[model samples]
Target: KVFGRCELAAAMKRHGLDNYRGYSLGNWVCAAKFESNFNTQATNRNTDGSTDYGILQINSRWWCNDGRTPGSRNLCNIPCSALLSSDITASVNCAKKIVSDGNGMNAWVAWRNRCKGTDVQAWIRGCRL
Candidate 1:
């Protein structure tokens, strides 16, 4: 499932992503825009054989257990498939976990490359809180 910017922003906020770990809703929205373009079913296989899943593109190596990623930590204690669901609740929770672990939003290179050091407020400019 794909989401419009406002739609995604609302979802993230509903799930408590706004100001999570000191990052604003726009920061999370902006990261998702670059990470998976708000597509809930997005997945990307890495060269190291770790696969990324869902809107936040949580990696299998550290977050979810896909059963195929080498030395999977499964820190989120969820199957990687859970991240691919269109519901996005799982992805949101996993994302919170990632940042809670001290990685911050920097865990997603997409966030670092596109959302960091920038005014992400525009991502949620028109979205009602």
Candidate 2:
């Protein structure tokens, strides 16, 4: 599903993304905005032939088993296709695992380049969360 901005915030909050790993809800909201524009089905192919999948754009290079990416760690222990489900629970769970694994929100380059060190509260201002 392609979520409206505030809708994404609510969903992320429901999945406990708020303040996870010291990053505020805004951080996640903003990152998702830049990562996949709140679209569950987003995908991007890397130049290295790996692909990014889902709302958080988890990469097949090291995080998921695409069965095509060379040397994939499959760190999330799931097929890359699982990340595209509209339910987003799997995506959320994988995101939490990514952060809890010490990758931090830095796992997403979009977050580091765009959301980090910014006043991201604006990303969630209209949300009641």
Worst 10 residues of 2 by lDDT: 99-108
Q: Write the per-residue lDDT of candidate 2 for residues 73-126, one digit (tens) a residue.
A: 888889999999988887888899898877798888999999999999999997
Measured against the true structure, the TM-scores of the candidates, in listed sequence, are 0.97, 0.94
Model 2 earns a TM-score of 0.94
Query: Which regions of candidate 1 fall more than 4 Å away from where they truly are?
Result: none
What lDDT is obtained when candidate 1 is compared to the true structure?
0.92
Q: Indicate the residue-level lDDT of 94 in model 2.
A: 85
Q: How many backbone clashes are present in model 1?
A: 0
Best by TM-score: 1
TM-score of the candidate numbered 1? Answer: 0.97
**Model 2 has how many clashing residue pairs?**
0
Cα lDDT, model 1, residue 106: 86
Please list the residue runs of candidate 2 whose C-alpha ends up more than 4 Å from where it truly belongs after superposition: none
For model 2, name the residue pairs that clash: none
